[PDB]
Amino acid sequence: EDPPACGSIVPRREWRALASECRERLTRPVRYVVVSHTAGSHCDTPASCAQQAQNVQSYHVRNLGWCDVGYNFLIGEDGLVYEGRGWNIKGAHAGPTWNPISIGISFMGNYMNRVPPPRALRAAQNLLACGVALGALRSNYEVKGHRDVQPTLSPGDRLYEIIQTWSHYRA
Amino acid sequence: EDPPACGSIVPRREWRALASECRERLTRPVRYVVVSHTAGSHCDTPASCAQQAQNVQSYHVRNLGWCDVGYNFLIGEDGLVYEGRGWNIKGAHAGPTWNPISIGISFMGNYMNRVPPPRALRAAQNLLACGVALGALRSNYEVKGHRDVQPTLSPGDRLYEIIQTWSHYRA
Amino acid sequence: EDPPACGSIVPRREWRALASECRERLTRPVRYVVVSHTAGSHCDTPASCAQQAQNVQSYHVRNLGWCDVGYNFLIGEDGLVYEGRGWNIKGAHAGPTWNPISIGISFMGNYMNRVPPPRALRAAQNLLACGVALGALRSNYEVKGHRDVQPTLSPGDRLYEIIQTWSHYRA
Amino acid sequence: EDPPACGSIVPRREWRALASECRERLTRPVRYVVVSHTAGSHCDTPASCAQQAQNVQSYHVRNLGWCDVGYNFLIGEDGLVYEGRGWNIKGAHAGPTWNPISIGISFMGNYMNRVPPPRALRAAQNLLACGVALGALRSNYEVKGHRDVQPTLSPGDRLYEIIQTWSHYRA
Numbered sequence A, B, C, D: 001e002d003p004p005a006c007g008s009i010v011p012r013r014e015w016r017a018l019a020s021e022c023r024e025r026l027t028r029p030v031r032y033v034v035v036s037h038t039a040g041s042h043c044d045t046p047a048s049c050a051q052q053a054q055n056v057q058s059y060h061v062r063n064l065g066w067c068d069v070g071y072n073f074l075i076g077e078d079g080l081v082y083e084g085r086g087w088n089i090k091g092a093h094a095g096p097t098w099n100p101i102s103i104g105i106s107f108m109g110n111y112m113n114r115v116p117p118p119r120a121l122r123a124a125q126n127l128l129a130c131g132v133a134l135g136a137l138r139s140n141y142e143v144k145g146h147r148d149v150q151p152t153l154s155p156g157d158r159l160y161e162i163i164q165t166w167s168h169y170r171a
């Protein structure tokens, strides 16, 4: 019953998220984390980043007919984590084989030629450790890059470069 | 005026494709066509494009553990079409919703800031007219840009701009 | 919204349904469809089935005190669809979580050790396509078994196996 | 192999139809629709109507020596449409002048003194809509009564006075 406050996550409520229609649950503890980037434009302020989390959701919900933004979490260059489908709802970010067994976090921006600032990277790792402390992720979870499970440039070369060094990454 | 009347396709063996291990079939006539790009590099000769079709397949078969290259057909800038999974086999290029009901054709290259050459676009429209002539594609099939059904930049800003002018493009 | 008033539905007055007292509405377009069975007596003729539809409403209204037959539509082995609360009104067939966001259709009979006849499955499917055309359902709607969203045997072992092969089925 | 047909048509084989041998094709989109009655017995259940469709085809095949049942589609009082020669084959229901430019639908029964139940009327109109839906009929298609293109009592007094009230009816 150990209680920690590892969630310095901006709530859907707070980034003006449209309401989710998703009902399918992940079974904890989740063993995989798949890292992607939106490939889109980036933000570096709480205000713009909240606004960007919105556009990403608008795209998935309005243009694509999805029950909610596809990621469980989004990482801003502002150093904040934006709540997506969360720890308990199966996301739609890495395909039918990986979605039901993973948490998909995506960095807001295109990282083919830039690396996300340290605070975005710090936000991501602290987010994952958080998950472990909650029991949402296996203490020994594995990190995959989006391009490792689906044909895509995601999460971007430079950021892909970075996640390959991470302690929990696995081929 | 009689039977086998359509398009020139570089066959699997001619580009050295690894044997296909896929078996799930499409239901002809197919109604949808999803246009993508590889997002990687391009080619402009029988030899380089036949080399590239191989890589793309390699990526999808080794690195992604798939039964065959994800696309039904790949388009080269050498103005030729490369047999992928073909007309009758369910591909893996657009998600579990569109894959079973569409034919995915991928242009080899990256077209965000670059358009395919005239002959690659002819090769592609010619392939479709061929799909119709054979009863593999509905007479009134619909063309979709990858970004219209999956979150991605595919098939690149420029190509995306082009397929939307197409007779069979339905938003 | 659109001109294709669709398919054939036996209207309320024809199967002689007591007037409905329901008022809550579903929001168009609806994302989910929950298939169930009545676990009651089966019928195979326009006359026998109308009677059966009447019995189900009767049980729901008179004994369970609902504002109307719980299902949005009922499906007879006579191969005809029967109107229930319709496409616009919130039904009562899958609990508090699902009734507000779904369309519940029910095959009239006990499909534990029987399958409904081909025509019944055809009417059921036609109804859904019709729903899409009308805009009552999402083009990318989802079909769920009653047992997937509630603790029940419904819609029967046989029919459950059958709805799993529907292109819109998502577990 | 995908969801069944609009109009919930009973397929040739489901009513144990003898294989067709007709080859002349209709040039859909077709302009006219001719409504006739079989002047045979009527039926009001799928079982009795499957047998009636069998009987009508057998009289056309065994006795008149035709390539198949004359009507493109048959309608039962059970409220189902039965597949005849379908949307693509020239019929043999209205004469050398009409069969080449029409779709012939026939109500199973004698409607001189009787009327067909609403469900039979509904299947018919829906079948017609399902026609254009598929693109087998022209948008502004015209409905003619059998006795409007040939000297005959078909489709009977009662049914004839009804189809006059239909919206797409003519002279």
Ligand SMILES: CC(=O)N[C@@H]1[C@@H](O)[C@H](O)[C@@H](CO)O[C@H]1O
Pocket (backbone or CB within 6 Å): C129, C133, D003, D004, D005, D006, D130, D133, D134, D135
């Ligand atoms: C809305 C609708 O019914 N559309 C029809 C459908 O019945 C059929 O399954 C499909 C494939 O042939 O052709 C469409 O025209």
